[PDB]
Design a binder for this molecule. Structure first.
Ligand code: NA
Ligand code: NA
Length: 195
């Protein structure tokens, strides 16, 4: 087995920008750059618009999804958060007229939150919608992304997912977001991108 990965923002032509670009950060120990939730989420967007009209991009490079990095400031390493910021800035520099949507699972939700907070006011305006699954900073950020408007966010925190409740206790409900990745989350992102 090889982890599910997509790198379409990095490989795409700047002369052929898509309607939408998804940047997604996986959860700790997951393989590839999309993990378990990123691939179904990108597939749902590509089913809606067509695969040529969405660029799906996972967060990799120095983001190694390491278990220890959940204990760091903001819930991931500074280098992993910087990698999110590099991809958001790449989306903006290559394809400024494309709609960006962001997502993350678990540590990846913390990475996504921090990288969106760190991005410019113009980049945040380009990110029309964000979905967080099992958000490890839900309690500490009071259900939001600092500096990002609530209408553009959905947080999926399962009943009994204690990572949403200021701990790092990972129980069965933390593994229950496959349906939101397939259904509610792409439906929400689609509403913000437009038809
Ligand atoms: Na695509
Ligand atoms: Na679910």
């Amino acid at each position: 087995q090889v982890g599910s990965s997509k790198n379409e923002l990095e490989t795409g032509s700047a002369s052929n920008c898509p309607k939408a670009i998804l940047i997604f950060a996986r959860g700790s120990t997951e393989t590839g750059n999309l993990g378990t939730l990123g691939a179904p989420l990108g597939d749902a967007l590509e089913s809606r618009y067509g695969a040529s009209n969405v660029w799906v991009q996972g967060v990799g490079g120095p983001y190694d999804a390491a278990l220890g990095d959940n204990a760091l400031p903001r819930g991931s390493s500074a280098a992993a958060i910087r990698e999110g910021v590099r991809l958001l800035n790449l989306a903006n520099s290559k394809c400024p007229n494309s709609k960006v949507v962001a997502g993350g699972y678990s540590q990846g939700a913390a990475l996504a939150a921090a990288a969106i907070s760190d991005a410019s006011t113009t980049v945040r305006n380009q990110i029309v919608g964000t979905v967080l699954f099992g958000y490890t900073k839900n309690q500490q950020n009071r259900g939001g992304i600092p500096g990002y408007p609530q209408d553009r966010l959905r947080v999926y925190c399962a009943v009994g997912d204690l990572v949403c409740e200021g701990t790092l206790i990972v129980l069965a409900p933390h593994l229950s977001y496959g349906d939101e990745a397939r259904n509610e989350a792409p439906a929400f992102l689609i509403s913000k991108i437009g038809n």
